[PDB]
Design a protein around this ligand. Structure first.
Ligand SMILES: [Ca+2]
Ligand SMILES: [Ca+2]
Ligand SMILES: [Ca+2]
Ligand SMILES: [Cl-]
Ligand SMILES: [Fe+2]
Length: 682
């Protein structure tokens, strides 16, 4: 016989413990034990428990199987989250270490030692069990679709229908459900306080963030009305993804030197500034044809010739910006809709009537808000990356090194996206496109999505926004690029530990199925779709790196930059309205403060926008931030060294951002590693 010393580490998360009866079967080269009882004492969350069981001597241990009887009549929560099992056999001179970091329901198979690719040499019984795991994953983790024009999501009726490995922790559930209760309370309290106010100035909106715990006053509250800070936010606000270098005006945007000359300040006219690379543009054309709430449909001309019903408007503006001699991005011209003419003219900061320029900025702001929330945030982080999270569960075995790499980063997205698909939520009460056009709009955007868009260096280059001498003070870019490189370096080092060359990439059928599943069933090239840029297979380590870097960066950094920026951005509503209530003007000279206030969001619309931001930006008490791999399943020493390097590099990037920030009038904090969750979980 053999003596086996067995130590089980239980996860610290809530409900991690069990009082199920637990047994363990040990398999090795010589045979296998029966199920042996792990009998005395409790399995509490965070516990490290020791057992000595005796049984057939299996020789060199090859795998183990844990069994839970699923508890008895009184068991509150028999599911048991196991971190690791360590075993010493009295007959083998070594320590077997079995990473888990997954929920044990009834049966769990675990292998000792380092991650392997499916073709690495292992006992046949290990290979058979790997295949059984993958077969089982394909039944639990299934595709489903909002429509032919949306990226694949997880099939699940409600959150509690998700497999436990992909549900929120009980901590995240509490964080989330508690934040909805507080939103409702803060709304009701605020509604009482402001019940009989007549809103008659921009400054009345400050009341609305005042009884909310937001992390501080939105940092644009004192400056939103200055052109300089309006422009700044196209670089450093919630939507830093659409501005591009203008190398020629669009044909439908006929801004002349005479429109903007009073704004230029380096001694050159528009044509020269265009050639000098100091002219930048955003074009919201994708918003043409959008159906806003109450029924208006956006046209190239705006809206046709139409009591207080809830009717909302949006725009498809172009706007032109100029980097002035002090390095500030200045807004210099806005055309509210696509089709130039006397009814859709060009507004500049030199309007005879100052209210007309303000109103033009609000229309540009409403376009941006609906674009940002639906395309930039929801679709391009949450919904699109969700397909890859799902594929990872379907196709990558738990012993696979790239399963182990992705685990900290895919966590959360399935949970929150399933919740969201249930939670007339908001959307609906706080966005002009709420009520159903928001789905059509994301479909519209999805048809253009390409995987190459998720490549940060390439996208910035392509936009022409990557030269700090022509476009200064772009901290999303600077911090983004430093994080991208750190992530890429680390991912490259992981790959090299397990893939020794490109044939290893080609021979790995799991990584091949992983990418193929997204290509075929995830980002489906359907009728009317552009190619989505997802490869059908992998041919090289470098290609494998690029895709994993895109993906990890997007889960963590990109989602953080466009999500957690929302308090500063939307907290003071006039800085970024997401609903407007009247149609654009058809001539100059009509705007007054009063007409402007009746166009801007109402008090409850603005309050419901703040409530949404409060929910979508609440970090949970158990959040893990970028590089914090304390709940990961790695055993390989070289992999742990790579992790060490990555963490020291993030720490260096962190200090550097802090030192940059202390010389900034408005520090840029959303891409600090300690503020970037590993994943998209809210
Ligand atoms: Ca439990
Ligand atoms: Ca004990
Ligand atoms: Ca370490
Ligand atoms: Cl490993
Ligand atoms: Fe989010």
């Amino acid at each position: 016989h053999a003596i086996y010393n067995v130590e089980v580490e239980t996860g610290d998360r809530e409900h991690a413990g069990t009082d199920a009866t637990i047994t363990i079967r040990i398999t090795g080269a010589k045979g296998r034990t029966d199920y042996l009882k792990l009998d005395k004492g409790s399995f509490e969350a965070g516990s490290k428990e020791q057992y000595t069981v005796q049984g057939f001597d299996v020789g060199d241990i090859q795998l183990i199987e844990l069994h839970s009887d699923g508890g008895g009549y009184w068991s509150g929560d028999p599911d048991w989250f196991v971190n690791r099992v360590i075993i010493i056999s009295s007959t083998q001179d070594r320590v077997y270490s079995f990473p888990c970091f997954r929920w044990v329901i009834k049966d769990m198979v675990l292998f000792p030692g380092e991650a392997t690719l499916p073709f690495n040499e292992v006992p046949a019984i290990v290979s058979e069990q790997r295949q059984k795991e993958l077969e089982q994953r394909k039944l639990t983790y299934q595709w489903d679709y909002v429509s032919d024009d949306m990226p694949g999501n997880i099939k699940a009726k409600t959150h509690d229908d998700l497999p436990r490995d992909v549900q929120f922790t009980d901590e995240k559930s509490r964080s989330y459900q508690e934040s909805r209760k507080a939103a409702l309370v803060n709304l009701g309290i605020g509604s009482l306080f402001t019940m009989f106010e007549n809103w008659d100035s921009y400054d009345d909106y400050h009341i609305l963030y005042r009884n909310w715990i937001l992390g501080g006053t939105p940092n644009m509250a004192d400056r939103w009305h200055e052109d300089r800070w309006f422009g700044y936010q196209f670089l450093n606000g919630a939507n830093p993804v659409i501005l591009t270098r203008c190398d020629a005006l669009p044909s439908n945007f006929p801004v002349t030197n005479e429109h903007v000359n009073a704004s230029l300040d380096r001694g050159k006219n528009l044509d020269e500034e265009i050639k000098d690379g100091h002219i930048y543009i955003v074009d919201f054309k994708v918003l043409v044809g959008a159906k806003s709430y109450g029924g208006p449909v956006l046209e190239d001309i705006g809206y046709k010739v139409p009591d207080e019903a809830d009717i909302r408007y949006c725009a498809a503006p172009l706007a032109l910006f100029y980097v002035n001699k002090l390095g500030h991005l200045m807004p210099i011209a806005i055309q509210i809709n696509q089709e130039p003419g006397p009814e859709n003219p060009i507004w500049t900061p030199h309007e005879e009537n100052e209210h007309d320029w303000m109103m033009a900025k609000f229309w540009l702001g409403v376009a941006e808000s609906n674009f940002h929330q639906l395309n930039t945030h929801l679709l391009r982080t949450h919904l699109t990356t969700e397909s890859f999270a799902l594929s990872t569960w379907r196709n990558l075995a738990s012993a696979h090194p790239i399963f182990k790499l992705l685990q900290p980063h895919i966590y959360g997205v399935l949970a929150i996206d399933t919740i969201g698909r249930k939670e007339g939520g908001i959307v609906d009460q706080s966005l002009s496109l709420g009520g159903g056009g928001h789905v059509t709009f994301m479909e519209k955007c999805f048809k253009e999505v390409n995987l190459q868009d998720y490549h940060l260096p390439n996208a910035l280059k392509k936009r022409g926004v990557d030269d700090p001498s022509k476009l200064p003070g772009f901290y999303y870019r600077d911090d983004g690029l430093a994080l991208w490189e750190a992530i890429e370096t680390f991912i490259g080092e992981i790959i090299a530990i397990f893939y020794k060359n490109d044939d290893d990439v080609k021979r790995d059928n799991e990584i091949q199925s992983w990418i193929y599943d997204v290509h075929k069933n995830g980002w489906r090239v359907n009728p009317g779709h552009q190619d989505h840029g997802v490869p059908a297979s992998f041919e090289s380590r470098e290609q494998l790196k690029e895709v994993l870097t895109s993906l990890v960066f997007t889960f963590s950094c990109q989602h953080a930059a466009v999500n957690f920026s929302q308090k500063d951005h939307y907290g003071f509503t006039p800085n970024a309205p997401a609903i407007l209530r009247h149609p654009p003007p058809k001539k100059k000279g009509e705007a007054t403060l009063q007409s402007i206030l009746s166009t801007l969001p109402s008090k409850s619309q603005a309050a419901k926008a703040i409530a949404t931001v409060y929910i979508l930006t609440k970090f949970s008490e158990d959040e893990r931030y970028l590089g914090n791999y304390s709940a990961t399943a790695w055993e390989d020493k070289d992999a742990l060294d790579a992790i060490n390097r990555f963490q020291d590099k993030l720490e260096d990037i962190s200090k550097k951002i802090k030192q940059r920030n202390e010389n900034l009038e408005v520090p840029y904090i959303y891409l600090l590693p300690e503020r970037i969750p590993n994943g998209t979980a809210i």
